[PDB]
Assembly symmetry: D2
Homo-oligomer: 325 residues x 4
């Protein structure tokens, strides 16, 4: 089965590799023409030179998948794609778009019979040999047409045991992809996956910090009562490892964290300045609009904010106040 791909980075590319390698004709493209050549020289991949050439080098109805950076670069492509496509022609979007962005786009497209499918792509610099968890939202037939594509790019049921409970047969979710519901729905679930990520990383991270500083009763701000109760130097890299078998906080993020600490035992190569792509933020904003109390996820987000010195004016404020006493 045949596909389009606008935008080719660390992701939009490694998509098309396990698309070909599975058994799919893929027809790639980009803005900076470097990415379109390297791909075109591998199994079942051809690098066109415009959005029109791609639609013409595909089967009607046409699947066309956009993994370009989010914001106004996404919007221009979708209002270009509008003129360069026809009816029956579904339009997957697997970049980090705000579920609400999708609402205006899918109206501009559902005008000219062009369909949108909001895709929640995750997996990263593993998603090629491990598969890319997708959370697709839109029309039920448009979805069904592409379902081939999605299975090829998911990790597949094999990736982990089936659910102690699922007797009978084996549904989308099990392999690693899901019609989440209508327009937005796709990206919405990706937001919250990211919410939980921040939360889950922060939990490990806070606990590891706790351990790292267990020795504060040797390293001698309040006057510490009971410095004998803080005399421990913890092999943080081994503690990370030990928790990998037979405990509860078993997780992919500890596996990576057990790596990163095997390589770099004091994570020196990282400064502290933690960026946030914006999906943490829209999860937090969702919670506040829904009246869902989410202090754990929203406080993981606020810790990143603080790690980039965005607490600055509040900190001057507190300093300026203490002086006045």
């Amino acid at each position: 089965m045949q596909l389009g791909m606008i935008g080719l980075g660390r992701m939009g590319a490694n998509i098309v590799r396990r698309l070909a390698k599975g058994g799919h004709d893929c027809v790639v493209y980009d803005h900076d023409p470097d990415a379109v050549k390297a791909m075109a020289g591998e199994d079942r991949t051809t690098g066109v030179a415009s959005l029109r050439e791609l639609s013409q080098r595909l089967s009607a109805p046409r699947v066309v998948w956009v993994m370009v950076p989010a914001g106004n670069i996404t919007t221009a492509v979708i209002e270009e794609l509008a003129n360069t496509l026809e009816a029956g022609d579904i339009v997957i979007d697997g970049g980090n778009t705000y579920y609400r962005d999708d609402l205006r786009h899918e109206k501009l497209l559902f005008k000219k019979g062009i369909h949108l499918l909001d895709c929640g792509t995750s997996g990263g610099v593993w998603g090629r040999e491990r598969g890319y968890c997708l959370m697709i939202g839109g029309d039920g037939d448009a979805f069904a047409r592409a379902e081939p594509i999605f299975a090829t790019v998911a990790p597949g049921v094999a990736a982990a045991p089936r659910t102690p409970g699922r007797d009978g047969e084996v549904a989308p979710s099990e392999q690693g992809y899901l019609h989440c519901g209508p327009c937005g729905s796709g990206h919405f679930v990706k937001m919250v996956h990211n919410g939980i990520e921040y939360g889950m990383m922060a939990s490990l991270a806070e606990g590891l910090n706790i351990l790292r500083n267990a020795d504060v009763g040797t390293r001698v701000t309040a006057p510490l009562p009971n410095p004998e109760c803080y005399q421990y130097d913890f092999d943080i890299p081994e503690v990370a490892e030990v928790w990998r078998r037979g405990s509860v906080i078993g997780s992919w993020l500890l596996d990576l964290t057990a790596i990163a600490l095997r390589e770099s035992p004091d994570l020196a190569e990282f400064s502290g300045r933690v960026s946030d792509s914006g999906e943490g933020r829209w999860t937090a904003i969702a919670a506040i609009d829904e009246g869902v109390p989410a202090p754990v996820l929203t406080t993981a987000l606020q810790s990143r904010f603080a790690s980039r010195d965005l607490d600055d004016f509040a900190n001057k404020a507190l300093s300026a106040m203490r002086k006045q006493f």
Copy 2:
């Protein structure tokens, strides 16, 4: 090798059954003879009826494991194990003891030459099959002598693929045990293990709730701006399922969360009040003394408190303030 076990509840019973089956001689004891009785028929196992009999039927040096209710039961046992065992003997506290409490137990035992190993014992009841992630603190030699036990209850390297970065032979951590350091350091890492568990769980929970209520535009206090954006009926169980492979948030908790949501889509039959160990509190008290920002871990802990209504006077003070300045009624 040969071993003693005081306390035969679910946990202490299953350790002996992992140990005996893995070729270890296990002398058992409990307060409850019928409980002692259960571990007589079992291969390589043997009941007693006092702490002196125990140490007469155990070759010097002895290694006695204590798996009993934490606090003044752990203490009282250890206090007689000081009159029962001789010099050079070792006591394993696998219990859920406060590391600060191990600092008192260490000194009260080395005043009759008895080494105190503190073992932090995780896993649950799966641990009899899969093994118990262990965390052991105290004497480097006492550990070394007693290590064949820890290796045996441990899940073992087989349990998870080796870490990309571990070139060569198989280190103690990879078995699922570790000499974490001096006395108390096993219970300490164990504490923080639980803190993390509270954080990871809360992160999923809050997450699932944010899906649960995406439908908040459908039903219609704060005037929800742009309600049309919140009009989804999410299949939470499938969403939990799909994340299981190809996501970043893949975990044993997410697995259980997917099982739990399969059997009961809306968790309709479940409690709503969430209790807390105390390891979760200790972690938060640790983090404050060291000057470690632990907003995520602590706020998971205090979420638990708020679910047992423990935030109620605070709530009454907010409502009281509100009436004063705004004439605001409660709905």
Copy 3:
């Protein structure tokens, strides 16, 4: 001078009665006739039953205060104030309008040349006497005209000793009112006033809660039950904190009242509403990358007090029921 007024609840009515005693003419109206009845008797207060009767009663250029429930009911009165007014007419929105909806309300009255003064009104149900702290936005010159209103409902400088370093002439700020900037800027500052108000309330509430359970030893095992044997008299700590302490505040003063009436705050359920300004502040904060754990945590505590954690508590229970 001469002023409109649409909505006569515990605020807008008590605004009028303050506006009056400082020699202003007021043209009241609210759905309920009985609402517009009571007022019609009070000084300089005129009981119409039509928006058009209202705008005919006013000597151009007009200025009309809108104090109605936020959301649709606010939009409804503003749309219909477009056709009820001409040009050079100022619309003072003193209700609890999301600043984003102020922008929409402004363009929609810039299409009849009607100035919007979005005014963040503070002070609650003490404001008839004590005055209302006010945070206005939109046009420098529309503000300029309405100014002598805004000083009347405000508390005036005399409400509190001048800031050390405040030399010379009493500024708008010091009188208890201020022009914050363009449209919205008024309701945006007020929004943030409420975010801070949530955090100050919660700071005291959580503190009182710690004292109330400091007797915890006399009833997750507690190490050292001898350290938790104090039965604090919360009414009296509240009152001692009023004089000579860092934490003196109006909210401490009101807390102190409430504990003198009700020492266990028995008549309050603890199910605590939030009216939207706390939420909009926390969204403003997330969008600007400003870390606000202390404010947002305080909001999340009101949600939890209404069982809005219920599904998550269920998830955690269901998880525990396995491992």
Copy 4:
């Protein structure tokens, strides 16, 4: 009546001075020579430099106030006062002592017949003119005996209007001093008083920072609707406006107003914030008691990050963020 003082920092002194004017006989001391000179040339004072000389210069039964640094030093001085004083006497520890320590100090001092009164003292430097909020614990009768000291060094009912509902005659509460209960009760309340301080300061600061950055729609995460965030607010004037007829009227607003008046970008100030320890204890009492205190505890945890104590954790996130999504740590602006 007549009163001993040990320790003469920014606090020890200003109680002496306030009492003398209130008409009490002060006897003083603090190691440093010049500090004992400075107090000896004022009304009803008497700068000594033995502790034995001080208990001579005082008449039994006596009242000594202690205002030396918390921990080692304050315990040192209580041990030594166990010899120096005699039965029926009274110790006022007004230091930033931990309530758990007052319970040891009350045992020691009882095994020589003396009474401890623990006094939680607030106010700051303004308390010489204005007075100090005292929160006192200890033996009911030793309070009655020392009450006149407390009543003098407190601001008195005159400092604020009477609470509506307070009938009739002035309760001590209303003076700004309170017997909070038995030994420690006083320091404990002061402890929580400080937690609340952290909570109110954070709430003002986070607010100021939201105002500060309302301009972000003119100046990573893509910002939806940046037409929304185009405000350049006057933080010094908003701080000032809020002081009259609002809900967040407080001292700390008053101070923040002054600070922003002197310095409207707080540009000279560090943005590394200390905590003293009452805040840490308040957070730990709350955890011990199953009292959810996320607002106080986060105000606390916001100072720790302000001192790069979130360092390792941040590295862990950047370590995680790399491994999964080859995410790049963006440079230091």
